[PDB]
From Swiss-Prot, chain A:
Effect of residue 156 to A: Dramatic loss of activity
Name the record gives this protein: Amine oxidase [flavin-containing] B
SUPFAM superfamilies: FAD-linked reductases, C-terminal domain (SSF54373), FAD/NAD(P)-binding domain (SSF51905)
Stated family: Belongs to the flavin monoamine oxidase family.
Swiss-Prot record, chain B:
Annotated GO MF terms: electron transfer activity; flavin adenine dinucleotide binding; monoamine oxidase activity; primary methylamine oxidase activity
Residues recorded as bearing N6-acetyllysine in the entry: 50
Impact after mutating residue 190 to S: No loss of activity
Name of the gene this protein is made from: MAOB
Subcellular localization: Mitochondrion outer membrane
Function: Catalyzes the oxidative deamination of primary and some secondary amines such as neurotransmitters, and exogenous amines including the tertiary amine, neurotoxin 1-methyl-4-phenyl-1,2,3,6-tetrahydropyridine (MPTP), with concomitant reduction of oxygen to hydrogen peroxide and participates in the metabolism of neuroactive and vasoactive amines in the central nervous system and peripheral tissues. Preferentially degrades benzylamine and phenylethylamine.
Keywords for the protein's UniProt record, in alphabetical order: Acetylation, FAD, Flavoprotein, Membrane, Mitochondrion, Mitochondrion outer membrane, Oxidoreductase, Transmembrane, Transmembrane helix
Chain positions found as S-8alpha-FAD cysteine: 395
Protein name listed in UniProt: Amine oxidase [flavin-containing] B
Species assigned in the record: Homo sapiens
Cofactor list: FAD
EC class of the enzyme, as a word: oxidoreductase
């Protein structure tokens, strides 16, 4: 029944919020729909794999909030394998390389690739992290899809193809599905193209020893009986002095304030009294989550390392079920494994198959890309299709279709009377990620502390000290990268000389 | 507790389904979230207006199901006033005209406008009404917004602006918000451009005497206490022998089958056991409804008729709050009124204002367009902003953003175990309209009759005889309309 704050959702965001409030001396309850905490993070444990992240997994430099939270909880990280060569597979052939970006030899194509990434970041700098709708050309950019933007920007098929894979991989959506403004924001608020795509010095640098599900699990341990499992919230009533929150299993909770720590669209599963204001009422029907199946194929040994491949594969082509892989071998060197993502339309397409049929297709793909018959000899397989999850809606995160972010974006984290909004989607730095979940949960909690008169306004948003364990190398460019012309820029130079 | 079929939603679709099953001898229950029936139709009564439709209102030729159902319930129609001239207001000036399409005089603009409408219908002929995802170019057209298609097709700003207004008015959404495939299907499944945009001989020909709300109300009258108001459904359990349906007010209903007669996305408000299949789980997060405020300004007399204007105004440009109006005067000539729609982003923008502030803006606009100071003296005002409705999600209907119809369209009316799907969004003819609501409700009911072995498979979909009261006249084109070149076509001849 009675408490100070009800937190709806026991993912990382809700758990971070609840922990902050609890540490501050408030009486909190977490109402979680599932029989587990963690949400879009889920660490499976069994004898064949020991542990494996089937949801969110990677952390990296500049993600200082998740690193600090996890450290405080007693967790350690380890580095994802990137010792050996990466592979870019294009038009049925594999091209090994080093560094974050697949190399390009053709001079025209090089100019086009260089300009593409540069332009993504150039446009990003126009977009405020905390208010993307305030970009000078917000409306123009929001009214085109990423497909349209790539069609304008990429003068080569090679760049367009790689850029398409980049979009699919980052946001588990097709280029024609998403707003250009929103995607440009999404990349910029992660620190830009280099930071978001990189393993070493980027978002995919590390994993947690024992899995990311431990973050939510250990917070549940600290909170004890305050976390209520299998309590899906169905109804929130703010007409009276205290907020009333009802669950599906017929329980009533009474609170001063509520934090909604669920994906924005999943707010639809709750009936509101009084009704939500118009803008939020419509916003939550306009913000779908992407589509992905995370697949892990296990092997006797990490055989790819012997061929001087680290296990990273960037795989372009409609035929390929998986467009991106990483080595998922344990830091001890055992439970050898390749993690792969089946993205966007392919997640829909290949969901029809059996688990065994997907495993077969993945092994045949990996065998070709790695030029290795050993890839046809898996010892185990695990997968999770996040599209089937009633209480997630998809993965990794919420995307915005054309026109939505400028029209409805401002209400994402606008409080509704005594309801405050957390969830990674409401973050301003690494929104979409575990990092964003922590930022949003702690910010929502502090909004409530401010409303109660416990902290001053300037303490709602708080900076985070850089991790001493995971230092961030700055993102740098070369003179040539900065000043080489685009393809149309070069054509202009040609036309002017011929005058 | 126990019945044969639970119908979720007491709009026209839910009511039509429940009536059909009831008339077949089954025990039905309608569970309705609101304290009223009708859903996206709502007729307000007071002394000042007598009655006014604040939701869906118009019916016309080829909408034979809604006309038949209404007639059976004892309703009659009257004609929307289109005796005098229509107005197209462009670049701050009113241009009166007759016929469905505003005329264009510049020869280049003429070719461009002609080609736009013609191309819309040309593309539509390749889109199956019952399976738009089966169009030969389904993926190409679905991966494009209407904004992109218009940018490609329209060589003049004039055609592009009118095309844009057309999209905004038809589907209460911006051209950049909606899939080209879906929009082309939408127009085609209403019978094409002329049929959808026409008052005389089209969708806006008629209104119901006493209001469209009477359709749902009179079915509720028939069903009596089988309709349960203020029963929002929260939970559907299909794990046992009988389907269990729970409401927010704690009641439990048990049935052999369920009809979901709510907008697809409002399916999100229900917790499912077992969970929905993946495709429907994601589909219902991908399908928003449009944005509109319906506004009716009342006057002492239908003064526009004195200047040989019928009251229809097509008003281009960002500045105008309302882009389209119709005469809403009653058949007797009293309760003189102009109905206007505030569409899409303008509904979002102008919702911030007070009711009185919106009235002033509309009156000043109408004064300019009609060229009459009489527009500045309203006697009454009614409005409804459908964006604020928890149990609608918007109006008029659900739109599909780029990429969604091809990926998820097929699951719209695919049954989920013992749940069948009604609602105008699942119709194949006038989906989005009251007509589509009737089609889908009766089809879903007949799917259940077939599942029970009461009727054969070929009786699930049923043709409708043409209304005797509202017969359809054929849509025609002229030789020149069919064969005049596009702008780039004329350029290739140069
Ligand atoms: C799924 C996924 C996610 C992911 C990714 C790969 C996949 C396959 N890779 C990531 C990565 O490598 N690194 C990273 O930092 N993030 C990655 N992501 C995304 C990440 O998992 C998410 O950003 C993060 O987990 C989100 O946390 P948040 O707390 O904001 O949100 P949530 O996990 O979805 O938790 C919400 C909880 O609420 C419960 N719920 C839902 N509805 C209700 C109702 N009505 N009542 C009560 N509880 C409700 C959910 O069950 C959930 O626990
Ligand atoms: C709003 C609007 C609609 C409209 C239009 C102009 C406006 C402003 N003009 C139209 C017109 O001139 N001619 C026409 O034929 N249609 C026009 N439209 C659209 C039309 O009103 C709709 O197509 C039609 O009314 C839709 O009917 P349908 O039966 O398919 O759907 P509904 O009216 O939305 O009814 C659904 C009912 O379900 C209830 N509900 C929602 N959730 C629940 C839950 N969880 N549990 C129980 N009941 C639920 C709703 O409250 C509603 O009553
Ligand atoms: N963090 S992850 O690998 O689970 C998904 C992901 N988001 O953005 C990326 C950019 C490049 C490679 C992967 C990703
Ligand atoms: N049926 S209505 O008037 O409520 C909305 C409507 N849909 O498509 C149209 C085309 C021209 C004018 C109006 C409309």
């Amino acid at each position: 029944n009675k408490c100070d704050v009800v937190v709806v959702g026991g993912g990382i965001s809700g758990m971070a919020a609840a922990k902050l409030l609890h540490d501050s001396g408030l009486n909190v309850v977490v109402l979680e729909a599932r029989d587990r905490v963690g949400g879009r993070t889920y660490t499976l444990r069994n004898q064949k794999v020991k542990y494996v992240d089937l949801g969110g997994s990677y952390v990296g430099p500049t993600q200082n909030r998740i690193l600090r939270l996890a450290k405080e909880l007693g967790l350690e990280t380890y580095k994802v394998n990137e010792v050996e060569r990466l592979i870019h597979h294009v038009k049925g052939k594999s091209y090994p390389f080093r560094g974050p970006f697949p190399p390009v030899w053709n001079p025209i194509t090089y100019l086009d690739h260089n300009n593409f990434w540069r332009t993504m970041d150039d446009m990003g700098r126009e977009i405020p992290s905390d208010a993307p709708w305030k970009a000078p050309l917000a409306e123009e950019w929001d009214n085109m899809t990423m497909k349209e933007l790539l069609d304008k920007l990429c003068w080569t098929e090679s760049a367009k193809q790689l850029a398409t894979l980049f979009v699919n991989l980052c946001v588990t959506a097709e280029t024609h599905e998403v707003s250009a403004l929103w995607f440009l924001w999404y990349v910029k608020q992660c620190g830009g193209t280099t930071r978001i795509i990189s393993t070493t010095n980027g978002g995919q640098e590390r994993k947690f020893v024992g899995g990311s599900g431990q973050v939510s699990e250990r917070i549940m341990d600290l909170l004890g009986d305050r976390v209520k499992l299998e309590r899906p919230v169905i109804y929130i009533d703010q007409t009276r002095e205290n907020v009333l929150v009802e669950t599906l299993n017929h329980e009533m909770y009474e609170a001063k304030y509520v934090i909604s720590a669920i994906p924005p669209t999943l707010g639809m599963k709750i009936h509101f009294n009084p009704p939500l204001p118009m803008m939020r009422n419509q916003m939550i029907t306009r913000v779908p989550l992407g589509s992905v199946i995370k697949c892990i194929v296990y092997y006797k040994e990490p055989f790819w390392r012997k061929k001087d491949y680290c296990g990273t594969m960037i795989i372009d082509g409609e035929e390929a079920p998986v467009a991106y892989t990483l080595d998922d071998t344990k830091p001890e060197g055992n439970y050898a494994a390749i993690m792969g993502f089946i993205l966007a339309h392919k997640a829909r397409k290949l969901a029809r198959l059996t688990k065994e049929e997907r495993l077969k297709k993945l092994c045949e793909l990996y065998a070709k890309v790695l030029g290795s018959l050993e890839a046809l000899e898996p010892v185990h397989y695990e997968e999770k299709n996040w599209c089937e999850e009633q209480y997630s809606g998809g993965c990794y995160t919420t995307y915005f279709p054309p026109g939505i972010l400028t029209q409805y974006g401002r209400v994402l984290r606008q409080p509704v009377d005594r309801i405050y909004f957390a969830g990674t989607e409401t973050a301003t730095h690494w929104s979409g990620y575990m990092e964003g979940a922590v930022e949003a949960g702690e910010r929502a909690a502090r909004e409530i502390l401010h409303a109660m008169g416990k902290i001053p306004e300037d303490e709602i948003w708080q900076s985070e000290p850089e991790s001493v364990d995971v230092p961030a190398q700055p993102i740098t460019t070369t003179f040539l990268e900065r000043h080489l012309p685009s393809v149309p820029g070069l054509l202009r130079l040609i036309g002017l000389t011929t005058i």
